């Protein structure tokens, strides 16, 4: 068919299950990406990850578990339903758009057997500002020469960032959580990647 | 004609002058998160509205929405730390300002209820620039409004410490709970444990 559907997938918490890492750490990591972005400062995502994890562990008196906890981040598993990226990539243009470096994301996707389904990997690092900076989403659109595209995410902040920057948003609510008001207005809500695929079939 | 050495202090309010330990901590973090997210996106929502929205969400997640009014009332009734009484002695030797995410009116109310407004010469709000801390605009609005070149931001919040530095202010970090340093705010110009130590440091600097 001649109807192009462009999907940009958030990675951490959307494709990859971040439930396995210390939640205070994931929150702190995200906090740092936001604070630095506000200040117009930039630190590579891997370093932000190491710095925030070490600090959180220090506070808990668990610094001896640093490598073990960092290993969990390095070995994140994709949610079971991401297997649907196979069917999805047959009918839609599948990209990654992440706070993570291109290299790190490529590595996570490859290890989970999903990289083959992606036509491109884009990083916030390219614009030295993190989500939800409108610069991140626009770099993606401009780089592929797209006007309309969907950002697929389970993160409320990313949903509203996408909308703010001119992308449509698909919110994947697997936790089935009460709506976080800041991300309360996605264009589409689905519960998982199977429902995502079904929505794409209907849209196509 | 003495003391011709001007010391300008801008005090962060929530968590620094006012003790926020009493409210739900997930709520205080969500409130702060919204201020950051909105600022990154170039969007603006009034701080009182961010407070109501984030508190109600957090309560709904906990199945405690029935406690909304009582929980909001704890925010409305924040107590100042005991050592903030030293703002009396400090105001005698330094220019004392408030610089807060909160609206002018809200900050004035909290300070007055706590008997501290008397010691302030001015109250500044991020609302004036429609961007929240640590946006450099907040700190620069303060400096420009009073015609200051050098000033100290006094805060117990690491983000505020680095925001001040980034925007050309000096920073005094007030570390009460004697905590391990949060690396993003790891380079304050001065570290003190409380307002009494703050006063003593100002006496030395004067």
Judging contacts by C-beta atoms under 8 Å, the chain A residues touching residue B43 are 164
The shortest C-alpha distance from A62 to chain B (Å) reads 13
Same domain membership, residue B98 and residue B26: no
A110 φ, ψ (degrees, to nearest 5): -60, -50
Given in angstroms, what resolution was this structure solved at? 1.9
- Alpha-carbon Rg for chain A, nearest whole angstrom, is 17
CA dist list (Å): A174 to A78, A85, A194, B57:
13, 16, 11, 18
Judging contacts by C-beta atoms under 8 Å, the chain B residues touching residue A38 are 36, 39-40, 134-135, 163
Interchain proximity B61–A181, CB inside 8 Å: no
Same domain membership, residue A100 and residue A36: no
Which of B31, B56, B76 represents a domain boundary (last residue)?
A: B76
Task: Give one DSSP letter per residue of chain B, joined into a string.
Answer: -------EEEE--BTTTB-GGGS-HHHHHHHHHHHHHHHHHT----HHHHHHHHHHHHHHHTT-GGGHHHHHHHHHT-PBPGGGGGHHHHHTTSEEEEEESS-HHHHHHHHHHTT-GGG-SEEEEGGGGT--TT-HHHHHHHHHHHT-S--EEEES-HHHHHHHHHTT-EEEEE-SS-----GGG---SEEESSHHHHHHHHHHH-
- For the record, the structure tokens of A146 come out as 């797209």
Does the annotation place A191 within a ligand binding site? no
Cα separation of A181 and B70, whole Å? 21
Question: If DSSP codes are grouped into helix, strand and coil, which group holds residue A150?
Answer: strand
Give chain B's contact residues with A (Cβ, < 8 Å).
29, 33-34, 36-43, 53, 57, 60-61, 134-136, 159, 162-163, 166, 179-180, 182-184
Q: What angle do CA A126, A128, A133 make, to 5 degrees?
A: 100
Which of A54, A74, A94 represents a domain boundary (last residue)?
A: A74
In B, minimum Cα distance to A158 occurs at B37
First to last CA, chain B: 14
DSSP 8-class letter at A84: G
The answer to whether the Cα torsion of A106, A173, A185, B44 is positive or negative is negative
Does the annotation place A122 within a ligand binding site? no
Same domain membership, residue A82 and residue A60: no
Report the residue count for chain B.
206
Which of A74, A107, A122 represents a domain boundary (last residue)?
A: A74
Interchain proximity A39–B182, CB inside 8 Å: no
Interchain proximity A160–B29, CB inside 8 Å: no
Pairing of strands B122-125, B95-100: parallel
Pairing of strands A150-153, A6-9: parallel
Same domain membership, residue B128 and residue B110: yes
Maximum separation of any 2 CA atoms in chain A, in Å: 58
Closest of B10, B32, B28 to residue B19, by C-alpha? B28
Same domain membership, residue B13 and residue B26: no
Question: If DSSP codes are grouped into helix, strand and coil, which group holds residue A177?
Answer: coil
Same domain membership, residue A110 and residue A190: yes
Same domain membership, residue B25 and residue B1: no
What CATH number should be reported for the domain holding residue B14? 3.40.50.1000
Chain centroid to Cα B104, Å, comes to 12
Does the annotation place A26 within a ligand binding site? yes
CA dist list (Å): B96 to B8, B91, B120:
7, 6, 5
Question: For chain B, what is the domain count?
Answer: 2
CA dist list (Å): A16 to A116, A133, B161:
16, 22, 34
Whether residue A170 contacts residue A150, with contact meaning beta carbons closer than 8 Å, is answered with yes
Judging contacts by C-beta atoms under 8 Å, the chain B residues touching residue A164 are 41-43
Same domain membership, residue B66 and residue B6: no
A50-69: string of b/e by CB count within 10 Å (b at 16+)? ebbbbbbbbeeeeeeeeeeb
Same domain membership, residue A86 and residue A28: no
Whether residue A162 contacts residue A169, with contact meaning beta carbons closer than 8 Å, is answered with yes
The shortest C-alpha distance from A123 to chain B (Å) reads 17
Judging contacts by C-beta atoms under 8 Å, the chain A residues touching residue B40 are 34, 37-38, 132-133, 161
In A, minimum Cα distance to B53 occurs at A181
The shortest C-alpha distance from A134 to chain B (Å) reads 7
In B, minimum Cα distance to A28 occurs at B182
DSSP 8-class letter at A7: E
What CATH number should be reported for the domain holding residue B61? 1.10.150.240
Same domain membership, residue B82 and residue B71: no
Whether residue B44 contacts residue B130, with contact meaning beta carbons closer than 8 Å, is answered with yes
As beta bridge partners, residue A153 has: A171
Strand ordering across the sheet containing A188-190: A120-123, A93-98, A6-9, A150-153, A168-172, A188-190
Chain centroid to Cα B149, Å, comes to 20
First to last CA, chain A: 8
- For the record, the structure tokens of A37 come out as 């972005």
Whether residue A117 contacts residue A82, with contact meaning beta carbons closer than 8 Å, is answered with no
Maximum separation of any 2 CA atoms in chain B, in Å: 62
Cα separation of A56 and A14, whole Å? 23
Judging contacts by C-beta atoms under 8 Å, the chain A residues touching residue B159 are 35
Chain centroid to Cα A66, Å, comes to 24
Same domain membership, residue B103 and residue B65: no
Q: To which residue do tokens 């005698």 refer?
A: B92
Cα separation of A100 and A50, whole Å? 13
Closest of A33, A133, A40 to residue B137, by C-alpha? A40
In A, minimum Cα distance to B159 occurs at A35
Q: Structural domain of residue A31, as residue ranges?
A: 18-74
Cα separation of A162 and A149, whole Å? 9
Interchain proximity B166–A40, CB inside 8 Å: yes
Method: X-ray
Judging contacts by C-beta atoms under 8 Å, the chain A residues touching residue B57 are 178, 180-181
- For the record, the structure tokens of B150 come out as 């050098």
Judging contacts by C-beta atoms under 8 Å, the chain A residues touching residue B26 are none
Q: To which residue do tokens 């370093």 refer?
A: A47
Same domain membership, residue A10 and residue A23: no
């Amino acid at each position: 068919g001649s109807h192009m559907i462009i999907l940009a997938f958030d990675i951490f918490g959307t494709v990859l299950d971040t439930s396995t890492v210390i939640q205070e750490f994931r929150n702190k990591q995200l906090e740092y990406t936001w604070l630095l972005t506000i200040m117009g400062k930039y630190v590579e995502f891997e370093e932000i990850t190491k710095i925030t994890l070490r600090y959180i562990l220090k506070v808990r008196g668990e610094e001896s578990k640093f490598d073990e906890e960092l290993n969990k981040w390095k070995n994140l598993k994709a949610y079971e339903d991401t297997k649907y990226l196979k069917e999805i990539s047959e009918i839609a243009e599948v990209y990654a758009l992440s706070n993570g470096s291109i290299n790190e994301v490529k590595q996570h996707l490859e290890r989970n057997g999903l990289l083959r389904y992606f036509k491109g990997i884009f990083s916030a690092e390219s614009v030295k500002e993190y989500k939800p900076s409108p610069k991140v989403y626009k770099y993606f659109l401009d780089s592929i020469g797209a006007k309309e595209a969907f950002l697929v995410s389970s993160n409320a902040f990313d949903v509203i960032g996408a909308k703010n920057a001119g992308m449509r948003s698909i919110f994947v609510n697997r936790k089935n959580t009460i709506v976080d008001p800041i991300g309360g207005k996605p264009d589409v809500i689905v519960n998982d990647f199977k429902e995502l695929y079904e929505w794409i079939l209907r849209y196509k």
